[PDB]
Design a protein around this nucleic acid. Sequence first.
DNA 1: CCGACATCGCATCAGC
DNA 2: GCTGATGCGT
DNA 3: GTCGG
Length: 326
Amino acid sequence: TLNGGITDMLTELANFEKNVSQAIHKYNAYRKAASVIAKYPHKIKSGAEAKKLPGVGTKIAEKIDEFLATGKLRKLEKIRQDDTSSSINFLTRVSGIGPSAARKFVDEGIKTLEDLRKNEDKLNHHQRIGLKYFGDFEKRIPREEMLQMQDIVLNEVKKVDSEYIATVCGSFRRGAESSGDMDVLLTHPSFTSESTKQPKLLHQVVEQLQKVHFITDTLSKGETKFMGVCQLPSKNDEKEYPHRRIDIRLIPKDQYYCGVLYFTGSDIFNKNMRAHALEKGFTINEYTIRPLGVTGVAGEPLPVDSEKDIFDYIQWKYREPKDRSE
DNA sequence: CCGACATCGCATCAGC
DNA sequence: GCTGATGCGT
DNA sequence: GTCGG
Ligand SMILES: O=c1ccn([C@H]2C[C@H](O)[C@@H](COP(=O)(O)NP(=O)(O)OP(=O)(O)O)O2)c(=O)[nH]1
Ligand SMILES: [Cl-]
Ligand SMILES: [Cl-]
Ligand SMILES: [Cl-]
Ligand SMILES: [Cl-]
Ligand SMILES: [Mg+2]
Ligand SMILES: [Mg+2]
Ligand code: NA
Ligand code: NA
């Protein structure tokens, strides 16, 4: 919050490049800059000072000076006035509508919430559900509620099969006092990198959660990744809780640490840590950490018996989940 | 310069 | 039906 | 948009 104004500006620009410009690298660049400035323990006094930080170059340093001087940025002042950009930026806020679909809908004349509602038949299932819960998905989740949700998910999963292990990751695991959604990592002894001794492992869980009316909708569902909606139960006469987004990822039990590291995030942290691994000669995904050969081909998975092991391979001192929020 | 920039599951599509 | 690309969220 | 070689 020391440099709240600057990081907001950059995030706004980041979203602009992603949604409107469809320039993924400019989007990631801006986010990186916002991130590194967000952890900077001093109130930025000038662009130069910010340029010293990695991820901050000349262009941003300059924007930063313009912003500190005027309290705003002309480039965005205009972006804000452009009807098309405003429309696209908005449509992309619906879960399931991306830069492409967004620009597409605008051409077809669909540019407002009202339009989406009246043209529901022009949306795929995911988008349909995204619009349905457009308001609720805008709401944050208090940790208190996350704890309530955790209890349910963990207790219902135990009911299905005592050998299931569900860990809540994402921002929750990093200690956030509020989260955008609930992310669940799931493991079962039967499902390993070696073999899948039992089918429907993920299905059985989603089924049990829908059975107790916890899961309300499904954005997408596969063999190992479920993407949907849930809602805490309310008491008598009690106003209902907002509908919450929920992601469930089933990972081979023997690849838990690479899996939990990944799902704990943050996304930017994963980005910087994976980028760092490549520079060290390794490649990391949610299943393993493999070395990179002379050709660039990833080799066999290196043994991993803890999150710290992964950090060691890349010569990075361990960092608790609470300190990976970049 | 200029090439890289993290990684991949699920939905949807085009072509054969 | 299959595969490969693309979108999207990850 | 920024970075490294
Ligand atoms: O682009 C992505 C998105 C997510 N992730 C990982 C890290 C992230 O913490 C985790 C869960 O994704 P969410 O989008 O749910 N983010 P998170 O839980 O960190 O924060 P929020 O409270 O917004 O959900 O998945 C990536 O690696 N890359
Ligand atoms: Cl780009
Ligand atoms: Cl501004
Ligand atoms: Cl592992
Ligand atoms: Cl792998
Ligand atoms: Mg999350
Ligand atoms: Mg999530
Ligand atoms: Na810099
Ligand atoms: Na969207």
